[PDB]
Design an enzyme around this catalytic site. Structure first.
Site, short mmCIF file in Angstrom:
data_model
loop_
_atom_site.label_atom_id
_atom_site.label_comp_id
_atom_site.label_asym_id
_atom_site.label_seq_id
_atom_site.Cartn_x
_atom_site.Cartn_y
_atom_site.Cartn_z
N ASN A 122 -8.91 5.17 2.69
CA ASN A 122 -9.60 6.36 1.82
C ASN A 122 -10.51 7.11 2.56
OD1 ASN A 122 -12.13 6.69 -0.30
ND2 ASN A 122 -10.19 6.89 -1.24
N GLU A 131 0.87 -1.37 -0.04
CA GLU A 131 0.00 0.05 -0.25
C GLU A 131 0.75 1.24 -0.03
OE1 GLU A 131 -2.91 0.69 -0.57
OE2 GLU A 131 -4.11 -1.36 -0.19
#
Length: 130
Positions: free
Chosen positions: A60, A35
């Site tokens: 997010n 990530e």
């Protein structure tokens, strides 16, 4: 900050991530590796839906944290997205835990499916003392 592999493994373990909702530490490591490369300051703007991914887990802004600039977004971790940009990952870990309590679990992150699911992730925790 960019964590060193084993340093992060123990940091995550101390935060209660080992086996959290059945997710092994190596899985979390694989997730953070792909990530953000273990970078707490990593950010990725998604021009397509006007959201932004924050921190070591690239969480997010649409559903998890509030940055005030994501349209129709919610804040499930009840955190300013700024909290996901700290060198101290305690808040980011609290939010990552919130994400996995949902039905999908670790599958919430597409990168986990692409690069960690059914993969040999032992390499991430080997020699870390965890």
């Amino acid at each position: 900050k960019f964590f060193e592999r084993c340093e992060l493994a123990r940091t995550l373990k101390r935060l209660g991530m080992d086996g959290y909702r059945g997710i092994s530490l190596a899985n979390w490591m694989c997730l953070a590796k792909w990530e953000s490369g273990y970078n707490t300051r990593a950010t990725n703007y998604n021009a397509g839906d006007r959201s932004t991914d924050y921190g070591i887990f690239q969480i997010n802004s649409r559903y998890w944290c509030n940055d005030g600039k994501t349209p129709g977004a919610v804040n499930a971790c009840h955190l300013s997205c700024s909290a996901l940009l700290q060198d101290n990952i305690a808040d980011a870990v609290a939010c990552a835990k919130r994400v996995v309590r949902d039905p999908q679990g670790i599958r919430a992150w597409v990168a986990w499916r692409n690069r960690c699911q059914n993969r040999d992730v032992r390499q991430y925790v080997q020699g870390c003392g965890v």
